[PDB]
Structure formats: C-alpha cells, structure tokens
Amino acid sequence: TIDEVPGMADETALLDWLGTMREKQPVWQDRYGVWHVFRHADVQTVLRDTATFSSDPTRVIEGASPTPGMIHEIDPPEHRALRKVVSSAFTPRTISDLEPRIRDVTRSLLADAGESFDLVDVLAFPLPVTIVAELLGLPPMDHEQFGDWSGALVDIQMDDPTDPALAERIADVLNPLTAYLKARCAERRADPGDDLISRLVLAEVDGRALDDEEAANFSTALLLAGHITTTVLLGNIVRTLDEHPAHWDAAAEDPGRIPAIVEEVLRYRPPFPQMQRTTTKATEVAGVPIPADVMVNTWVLSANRDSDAHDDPDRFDPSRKSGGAAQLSFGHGVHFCLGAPLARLENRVALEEIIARFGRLTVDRDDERLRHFEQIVLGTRHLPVLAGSSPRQSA
Numbered sequence: 001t002i003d004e005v006p007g008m009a010d011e012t013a014l015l016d017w018l019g020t021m022r023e024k025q026p027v028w029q030d031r032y033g034v035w036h037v038f039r040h041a042d043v044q045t046v047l048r049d050t051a052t053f054s055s056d057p058t059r060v061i062e063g064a065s066p067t068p069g070m071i072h073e074i075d076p077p078e079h080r081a082l083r084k085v086v087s088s089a090f091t092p093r094t095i096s097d098l099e100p101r102i103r104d105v106t107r108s109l110l111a112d113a114g115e116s117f118d119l120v121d122v123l124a125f126p127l128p129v130t131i132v133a134e135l136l137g138l139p140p141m142d143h144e145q146f147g148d149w150s151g152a153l154v155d156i157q158m159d160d161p162t163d164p165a166l167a168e169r170i171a172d173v174l175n176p177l178t179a180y181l182k183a184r185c186a187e188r189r190a191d192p193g194d195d196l197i198s199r200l201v202l203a204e205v206d207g208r209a210l211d212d213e214e215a216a217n218f219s220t221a222l223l224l225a226g227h228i229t230t231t232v233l234l235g236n237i238v239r240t241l242d243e244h245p246a247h248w249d250a251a252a253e254d255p256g257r258i259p260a261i262v263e264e265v266l267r268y269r270p271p272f273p274q275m276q277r278t279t280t281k282a283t284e285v286a287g288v289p290i291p292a293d294v295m296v297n298t299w300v301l302s303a304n305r306d307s308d309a310h311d312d313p314d315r316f317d318p319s320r321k322s323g324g325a326a327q328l329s330f331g332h333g334v335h336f337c338l339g340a341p342l343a344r345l346e347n348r349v350a351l352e353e354i355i356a357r358f359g360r361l362t363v364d365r366d367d368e369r370l371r372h373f374e375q376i377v378l379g380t381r382h383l384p385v386l387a388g389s390s391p392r393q394s395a
C-alpha cells in the first residue's frame with residue numbers, strides 16, 4: 001500500500017496526510033511494524049507513561065544495548081537519578097549568563113554576511129555550536145574530524161528505526177565525538193574549573209556521580225540536541241515570518257513580541273516532529289491494541305496541528321493564549337527538554353539581532369527551491385536569504 005509515513009520534505013503533503021490519519025486512523029502500524037500516534041491527547045498519553053512506553057530504543061534493536069549517560073534513552077528510576085545529577089550542573093543561571101555572548105557572536109556573524117547569504121551557514125549552524133562548545137569549556141571551534149549532524153541526517157537512511165545496521169551507522173558517526181568529549185572530561189576531572197564539563201564531573205546527588213563515559217555521553221547529547229534543533233528552529237522562524245511578513249514590522253516596533261513568535265513557530269514547525277518509544281507490554285491507545293516490544297512514534301507535528309488541542313491550528317498566530325501553556329515541541333513528562341531555556345534564549349537573541357540589523361529577511365529561491373531534510377527533523381538544510389535593507393546601504 002502506502003505503508004510508510006510520507007517524507008518530511010514535502011511539508012504540505014505530510015500535513016495533509018497527518019490530518020487524514022488523525023480523522024480516520026489515529027493509531028497506525030507501518031510496514032516495519034512501527035506504530036504511529038497522531039492525535040494530541042494520545043501523543044500526551046504515550047509520552048506520560050514511561051512504564052508502558054520506554055525511552056530505551058535498544059529494547060527492540062537486535063544486539064543493541066543502552067549507552068551510559070544518554071539520558072533521553074534511559075528510563076526511571078535511573079533516569080530520575082541521572083536527571084538530578086546533570087540538572088545540578090546545567091543550571092538556570094548557567095544559561096541566562098550566556099545572553100551577552102550569544103548576542104556578541106550573533107551580531108558579529110551577521111555584520112559580515114552582506115545582503116545575500118545562507119542564513120544556515122552564516123548564523124543558524126555556527127551559533128549554537130559556538131555557544132554550547134563554550135558552555136562545555138571546549139576549544140574555540142571544533143575544526144576537526146567529527147563531522148556534521150546535517151550530513152548524517154541526510155546520508156544515514158532511517159526508514160526502519162528498528163534496523164540494527166542503522167544503530168551501527170549512528171554509533172559510527174557519534175563514537176569519535178564521544179571519545180573526544182571523554183578525554184575532555186578526564187582533563188576537567190584532573191583540573192576542574194566552572195565550565196559545564198567540570199560541573200558535570202564534580203556533580204553528585206544522593207551519592208550518584210558520573211563517570212567520564214556517562215559525562216561524555218551526556219555532553220554528546222547536550223551538544224547535538226542543542227545544535228540540530230536550534231539550527232532548524234532559527235531557519236523555521238525566518239521561513240515562517242517570510243510567509244507572514246507583517247510580523248517583521250510588529251516585532252521591530254515591539255521586540256517584546258519575539259518570545260511569542262518563537263513559541264508559535266515551535267508549535268507550527270517543531271524541529272523534531274516525532275519522538276520514539278518502545279512498548280514494554282501489551283497496551284492500547286485510543287482503543288487500538290499495540291503489542292509488547294514494538295516501537296511507537298509520537299507525532300508532535302500532528303498533535304500541534306490538532307484542532308482538538310488548538311483552535312484554528314493551521315493559523316500562524318503568535319497571539320494565541322493556550323493559557324497556562326506547555327510547549328509540546330519540547331516533549332511532555334519527565335524527559336521534557338532540559339535545554340528549553342537555552343533554545344528560547346538563543347532564538348530570541350538571534351531574531352532580535354536579525355531585525356535590529358536588517359528589519360526583515362526573505363527566502364531567496366533564485367537558483368533553486370529549498371533543500372528540506374527528508375527525515376527526522378522538520379526544516380531545511382540551507383536557507384538562502386535576501387536582506388532588502390542593511391547598514392551597508394548608502395547614498
């Protein structure tokens with residue numbers, strides 16, 4: 001049939017399909033025996049229940065085993081212990097103190113880019129890398145062998161998330177970065193300062209401390225998790241504003257409007273449209289029977305466009321209240337994004353600085369249509385933009 005999800009690149013086709021599935025087949029089993037959950041309430045059910053819906057994907061991957069410290073793949077009770085330890089290092093003030101540096105890097109990168117440039121190469125890709133590397137206390141740039149998440153997301157085929165060859169390909173690209181970070185952890189254990197690696201090595205809650213393997217794996221997650229998403233989100237923000245360009249002047253008149261724009265783009269175009277769980281036992285969602293030991297994909301993108309959860313869900317409306325709102329694009333329940341305040345800060349500052357310098361940007365399709373990611377993330381690999389105004393213009 002059509003027995004696998006449509007690709008991410010054709011966003012309109014994907015959204016239309018998700019709409020039909022919410023209506024007609026809200027819990028769906030694909031040709032790989034992977035289940036998919038489309039309605040907002042059911043996505044929340046799945047994410048809340050950690051006992052039934054495990055975050056350990058290795059349960060269903062032949063030969064695979066858990067990676068110490070990879071907090072997003074660990075279940076309670078270990079998850080709770082680990083989250084406490086890392087939270088005691090990665091604190092609110094650790095994040096808020098980054099604002100001036102975030103602003104400095106952003107302003108300097110944009111000041112040199114001219115009026116026609118790739119937003120991703122110039123800003124959205126380097127900014128989060130630079131910031132989180134400095135937070136961790138890593139050497140200026142990682143101009144080294146570890147590669148690029150953007151390439152992996154394109155080159156490693158991820159159709160069937162239970163395939164062992166896939167888990168291997170992921171470990172193949174990640175292992176060198178994790179080994180590098182493990183060496184940095186050992187170095188900070190020898191001579192700790194107050195960078196985040198040192199704080200992670202010195203952290204201890206209820207007698208639980210991280211070994212270098214766990215700290216390195218956690219630092220790997222933190223690094224990639226903060227990078228991919230913040231890069232994709234900033235592209236999505238500029239793409240979405242270019243579709244509703246009255247908001248550029250609104251935010252220039254009152255930059256206080258920017259946080260709400262960031263939240264609404266997160267709802268509208270979530271960088272991670274889906275999350276994966278594995279059932280630990282037979283269970284039902286929406287009265288649909290799901291067996292034990294299978295993977296379940298929760299479609300946050302579909303939940304966010306579900307009219308049961310959001311009025312006029314396909315309207316981009318930064319004014320929406322969803323009063324006392326939680327942001328499903330950062331998850332739900334105990335794995336809720338640890339990095340959300342940093343993501344919000346980086347994208348606020350970036351949009352502030354774009355508007356301060358240029359007033360607006362528009363997407364440039366002079367040479368080609370955009371190259372969308374086809375899997376995993378909802379976003380584009382590059383985003384050529386044009387500034388119709390900048391401080392370079394003269395009489």
Ligand code: HEM
Nearest residue numbers: 071072225226229230233271329330331335337338339343
């Ligand atoms: C807009 C940007 C971001 C988005 C959309 C996002 C999204 C998410 C989502 C959906 C989850 C839940 C995963 C699940 O339930 O399986 C999550 C968890 C996590 N995120 Fe983010 N993230 C973002 C930025 C960041 C940043 C900047 C950092 C690091 C500074 C970060 C670090 C993490 C970590 C460590 C977890 C795992 C928490 C746990 O398992 O307890 N994220 N994020």
